[PDB]
């Protein structure tokens, strides 16, 4: 198996024990993972067609030709209703992620005069205050994994006010990168190594991260895709290998 395949399975594992909730994979790598989960160990998840309908089956990523069977309607209004209700797990990209799990997809630099403009905060604030949120990063480097983000789009554990029960649904879960799986179980919910992908040393992660990752030297190897997982990824879910464009070098 390749690095991309190990990553796809790591993304799939984000949804183990998800139950019957909406999974919203906002990258191709997360979307391969989500479809793998639906076909295997998380069969009850809901998935949209990338627009406004709920898919009945689990077709190949990016595919054209035969129309998809649907099981429901999920326009953007209903996504907002669903997310505030809490029955969702979103996997987003991230231009920056910091050690308490704050995410930036908004801009670089000062708020009223950025040095580079991206999308704005989008739904990141609503997502991170309401339900399970995870991140996919395809090029784990110091410019992504920073001490503190320029703009807080997705909130991290340091922003939780323990005296305000409005923060009680925060659940920033994991970061899956081209190097490893990470969580926020370190001290003060600082970033901690769950696992390192085969071929990745602690030194690789250390040289690619602007802060120290907790338990990095003790981190086991990320599990290999099984033969059945490889079959589903290669032949059923991602036959065009869109997963390979998600990671670099």
């Amino acid at each position: 198996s390749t690095r991309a395949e190990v990553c796809a399975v790591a993304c799939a594992e984000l949804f183990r024990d998800a139950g019957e909730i909406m999974i919203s994979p906002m990258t191709n790598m997360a979307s391969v993972g989500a479809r793998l989960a639906r076909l295997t160990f998380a069969p009850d998840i809901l998935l949209t067609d990338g627009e406004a309908q709920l898919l009945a089956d689990t077709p190949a990523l990016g595919k054209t030709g035969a129309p998809n069977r649907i099981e429901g309607w999920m326009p953007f209004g209903r996504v907002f209703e669903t997310l505030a209700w809490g029955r969702r797990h979103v996997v987003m990209g991230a231009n920056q992620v910091d050690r308490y799990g704050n995410q930036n997809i908004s801009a670089f630099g000062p708020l009223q005069r950025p040095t580079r403009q991206m999308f704005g905060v989008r739904g990141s604030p609503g997502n991170t205050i309401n339900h399970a949120t995870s991140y996919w990063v395809g090029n784990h480097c110091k410019r992504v994994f920073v001490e503190a983000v320029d703009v807080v789009s997705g909130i991290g554990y340091d922003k939780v006010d323990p005296d305000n029960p409005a923060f009680r649904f925060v659940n920033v879960y994991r970061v899956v990168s081209n190097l490893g799986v990470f969580d926020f179980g370190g001290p003060d919910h600082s970033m901690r190594a769950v696992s390192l992908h085969p071929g990745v040393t602690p030194g690789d992660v250390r040289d690619a991260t602007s802060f120290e990752v907790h338990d990095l030297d003790a981190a086991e190897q990320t599990r290999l895709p099984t033969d059945d997982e490889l079959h589903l990824i290669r032949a059923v879910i991602d036959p065009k290998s869109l997963r390979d464009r998600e990671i670099r070098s």
Binding site: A84, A107, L111, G120, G126, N164
Partner: protein, 292 residues
């Protein structure tokens, strides 16, 4: 019943400089692009814009007509994703940014539709959004305890009242009843309900009985109370997607973005597409397409 059919320029001449306007649709999807092009032809400027932003906002920024923007995001929905005119406005410090979470924008329109001064929301708490608002965005405390004890403090999302709103739909009658024929209404109803002046464009104006026979009742998003003036604008969403009518013009949108990257390229784009009427634009666009 009143005949509310008007022309693009006639609608836009009801705007005044300094107004707060709402632009409906979402990103590069069912945007009132013909209304935006008519704003570019007028002298109206210093606009405060409320939008789920896309090339609508880009065009207004390219004209230097925007003072402040309240937005949940800005996206072209396809590569290069970021709108280059919005990016220029932001990086140059040309606009005041009232950035917010996507759900917050909807909530703000809902409060205006209900004529309420605020609605409470969790979205925003802990994020950079309050800092964009420079102390304008306040909180509210619940008078009822959370299940668990303690009282929640929530964002008090203020009403996003509008002086005018612009929307585009697929089919309408001459009195302003209208339907969307795609999969998503977005939030066009809230944009209209939040505004003092309501302006709608449609691909085609038909008889009422034709309108109601061509869609399920659930698609009849707009009634006569929600519209002051309707404009027949075939291709009026171009270059954004208008669902079964036509898709996003992907090649033209890329051409738009490339042209924005240089002074000469933009001047040539303005000359070719934006220096005549809506009919001139539609003919120039068809010619770009015929070439490919």
């Amino acid at each position: 019943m009143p005949d509310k059919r008007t022309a693009l320029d006639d609608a836009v001449a009801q705007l005044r400089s300094g107004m707060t306007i709402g632009i409906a649709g979402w990103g590069s999807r069912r945007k009132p692009m013909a209304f935006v092009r008519a704003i570019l032809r007028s002298d109206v400027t210093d606009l405060t814009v409320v939008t789920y932003g896309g090339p609508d906002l880009g065009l207004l920024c390219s004209a230097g007509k925007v003072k402040r923007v309240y937005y949940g995001f800005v996206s072209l929905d396809s590569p290069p994703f970021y709108d280059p005119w919005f990016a220029h406005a932001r990086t140059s410090g040309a606009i005041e940014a009232r950035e917010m979470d996507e759900g917050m924008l909807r909530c703000g329109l809902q409060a205006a539709a209900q004529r309420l001064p605020f609605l409470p929301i969790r979205a925003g708490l802990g994020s950079s959004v309050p800092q964009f608002w420079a102390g304008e965005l306040q909180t509210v405390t619940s008078p009822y305890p959370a299940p668990g004890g303690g009282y929640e403090t929530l964002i008090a999302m203020p009403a996003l009242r509008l002086d005018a709103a612009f929307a585009h739909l697929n089919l309408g009658d001459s009195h302003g009843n209208a339907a969307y024929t795609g999969i998503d209404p977005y939030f066009d109803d809230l944009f209209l309900m939040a505004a003092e002046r309501r302006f709608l464009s449609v691909e085609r104006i038909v008889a009422t009985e034709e309108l109601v026979k061509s869609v399920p009742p659930q698609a009849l998003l707009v009634n006569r109370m929600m519209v002051d003036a309707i404009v027949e604008a075939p291709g009026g969403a171009h270059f954004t997607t208008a669902a079964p009518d036509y898709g996003r013009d992907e090649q033209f949108q890329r051409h738009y973005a490339e042209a924005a990257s240089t002074q000469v390229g933009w001047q040539q784009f303005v000359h070719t597409y934006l220096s005549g009427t809506e009919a001139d634009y539609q003919a120039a666009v068809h010619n770009f397409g015929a070439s490919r």
